[PDB]
Amino acid sequence: MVISEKVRKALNDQLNREIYSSYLYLSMATYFDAEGFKGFAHWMKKQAQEELTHAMKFYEYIYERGGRVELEAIEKPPSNWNGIKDAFEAALKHEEFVTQSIYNILELASLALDHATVSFLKWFVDEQVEEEDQVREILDLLEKAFGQMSVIFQLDRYLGQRE
Amino acid sequence: VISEKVRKALNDQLNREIYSSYLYLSMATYFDAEGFKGFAHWMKKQAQEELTHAMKFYEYIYERGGRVELEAIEKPPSNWNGIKDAFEAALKHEEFVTQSIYNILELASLALDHATVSFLKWFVDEQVEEEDQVREILDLLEKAFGQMSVIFQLDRYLGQRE
């Protein structure tokens, strides 16, 4: 182990946090499927495969560092919200808490003098000043829709074709 | 149009198959720790395979006008007493899902939901070769007892599963 047990613990908690991001985004699908937004569910669903691919990268990095991963319990996510906005609001806060979480690991890793993990985390800070700019954009759109259903379908149908 | 009862049983089965993906990944976090990348690679294909099963239960529960509810995922075990002790846990885990499919297959045939019955039959099959992949490994093991030599032959071979 060239990592410190301190930085590998934090990289391990971050692996656990995105697994839960993958479960919470899947759960927002179950709601969006339930309320008939197939395109909003499709998107959440692929936001869940994307957070899982992030966990893989954390997973493998821990092991090349020399360390080992330990998985923790996943607690049951919210299943129902107050509407499309309330759900996509929720994706926005969660995509902000993880933006802050990855700031602490970034710091922590520079405080620890870990030049590699910092560099490795370089891609994730950028990755997620995108992702939570997308989500806010999403929510700023369904506002001016104003419950006008014509253009919510328009957004369902458009986020529904993210590949 | 699924009944509430047939729904409930498929919703639990979906949450059980998710725990299986998680358990097998956890088993992969023990295997790379102990230095077997083939066995860990093999557990990683399996978990992601359990995932796929759990999204087919998913699209089906919405084809029939139901909704998935996602329950809490218990913490997996993280250590066992060796490779065969883990693949021991493997076989037993997927013997129990195999009997939990049958009970749904009954429950739905009594329903008489002929639609969920027919679809489970894909799983009943695919599930009754999942155990046999694990069954022969446990014995591909057991006769291995030791000879870390062929255990390493084995780990190499398992490690190329796609």
Author numbering:
A (entry chain A): 2 to 164
B (entry chain B): 3 to 164
Question: Anything the authors wrote about it?
Answer:
Four helix bundles are also attractive for synthetic chemists because its interfaces are dominated by side chain and side chain interactions, which can be more tunable than β-strands. This study focuses on TmFtn, a naturally dimeric protein consisting of two antiparallel four helix bundles, as shown in Supplementary Fig. 1. Thermotoga maritima ferritin (TmFtn) naturally occurs as a dimer; twelve of these dimers interact with each other in a head-to-side manner to generate 24-meric hollow protein nanocage in the presence of Ca2+ or PEG. By tuning two contiguous dimeric proteins to interact in a fully or partially side-by-side fashion through protein interface redesign, we can render the self-assembly transformation of such dimeric building blocks from the protein nanocage to filament, nanorod and nanoribbon in response to multiple external stimuli.
We made a mutant named FLAL where Asn147 was replaced by aromatic phenylalanine (Phe) residue to create π–π interactions, while Glu112, Glu113, and Lys114 were replaced by three hydrophobic residues Leu, Ala, and Leu to decrease the electrostatic repulsion and increase the hydrophobic interactions between two adjacent dimers at the same time. Therefore, besides calcium ions, we also investigated the effect of PEG on the assembly behavior of FLAL molecules because PEG is a hydrophilic nonionic polymer widely used in many biochemical and pharmaceutical applications due to its mild action on the biological activity of cell components. After trying different molecular weights (PEG1000, PEG1500, and PEG3000) and concentrations (10, 20, and 30%) of PEG, we finally obtained nanorods formed in the presence of 30% PEG1500. To determine the structural basis of such nanorods, we set out to grow single crystals large enough for X-ray diffraction analyses in the presence of PEG1500. The crystal structure proved remarkably similar to the design model: protein molecules connect through designed π stacking and hydrophobic interactions in a side-by-side repeating pattern with adjacent FLAL molecules antiparallel with each other. Thus, the crystal structure is in good agreement with the above results observed by TEM, confirming the side-by-side interaction manner of dimeric FLAL molecules. Taken together, all these findings demonstrate that our protein interface redesign approach yields assembly of dimeric FLAL protein building blocks into the filaments or nanorods induced by Ca2+ or PEG rather than the inherent Ca2+-mediated 24-meric protein shell-like assembly.
